[PDB]
Amino acid sequence: IGMTVEFIPHLFGTNRRPNGSRGWFAYYRMGADVVNPNAFRLLNVETAS
């Protein structure tokens, strides 16, 4: 799913009554991973201590 933005009309506080503020909520869903590890080559220049 893509980027969706939502408008919360009313927030609350520590005593569950309105505290005079609002907000904008957004979320996103994706995922990835490497299937075959032998189809790549990566150069590693590591510095000895």
Added chain:
Amino acid sequence: VSSAAVQWSWDAEFEEVSDDSPEFGQPEIPVKKAQGFVPISIEALQDEA
């Protein structure tokens, strides 16, 4: 006006979000003046072409 982007984060299911309100700044540019002046004689203004 100048500002920066909000910071997203990868959260799990039923995980509370953290507020990401960004900060703002304001540049400023003053306006200054420059001038030049030249006086001429009446006889000259009529003689010189």
